[PDB]
Amino acid sequence: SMLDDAKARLRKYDIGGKYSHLPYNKYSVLLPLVAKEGKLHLLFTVRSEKLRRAPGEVCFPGGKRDPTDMDDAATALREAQEEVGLRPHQVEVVCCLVPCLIDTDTLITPFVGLIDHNFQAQPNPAEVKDVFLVPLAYFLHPQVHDQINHIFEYTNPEDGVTYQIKGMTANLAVLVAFIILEKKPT
Numbered sequence: 001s002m003l004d005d006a007k008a009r010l011r012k013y014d015i016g017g018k019y020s021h022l023p024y025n026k027y028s029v030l031l032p033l034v035a036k037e038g039k040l041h042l043l044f045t046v047r048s049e050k051l052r053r054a055p056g057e058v059c060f061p062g063g064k065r066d067p068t069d070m071d072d073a074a075t076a077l078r079e080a081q082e083e084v085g086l087r088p089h090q091v092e093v094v095c096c097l098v099p100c101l102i103d104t105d106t107l108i109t110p111f112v113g114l115i116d117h118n119f120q121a122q123p124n125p126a127e128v129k130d131v132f133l134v135p136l137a138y139f140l141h142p143q144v145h146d147q148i149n150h151i152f153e154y155t156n157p158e159d160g161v162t163y164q165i166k167g168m169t170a171n172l173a174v175l176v177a178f179i180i181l182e183k184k185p186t
């Protein structure tokens, strides 16, 4: 099946806990995979303005580890619940992808999660201004704009609204698309 095929591909790139004990400032992100209309999609947030860290940007759900988190996957799930109301029974964490090093003292750990078909996003307006889906296949042939910095523009065919996706978020989206969609019969 489509979902079993995706999880089996993703498992080959799981690094597990290999890098999780190193002494960094620690953040996790959840890359949430949603099946709709026979295709895979990724779920993105638009961050609120009132936030000190990173206002108005397109990002995956996530944030800073705290002392309650049992492990780095727990951080990602805690933060996804607070931002969009995703509950634990509604997500299966499939793997941990290559972490991202930033600013010399920070390590960001990405987890891929499969999302239950009955989940419906409840944006928390104190953290998130918007929540939207992008088909995974988009990231193999994106609409690119140069700010030189590469920026993707995605227009939702439902309402004509355009979103800009860039930086680590765009890099991780392309990676997940390559892992899941490369070399597939039609």
Ligand SMILES: O[C@@H]1C[C@H](c2ccccc2)[C@H]2C[C@@H]3CNC[C@]31N2
Residues within 6 Å of the ligand: 027, 053, 054, 057, 058, 059, 060, 102, 103, 106, 108, 167, 168, 169
């Ligand atoms: O907040 C996250 C994590 C990263 C981060 C960088 C520096 C300090 C803290 C955190 C970057 C890259 C991520 C893209 N979405 C916002 C985002 N900023």
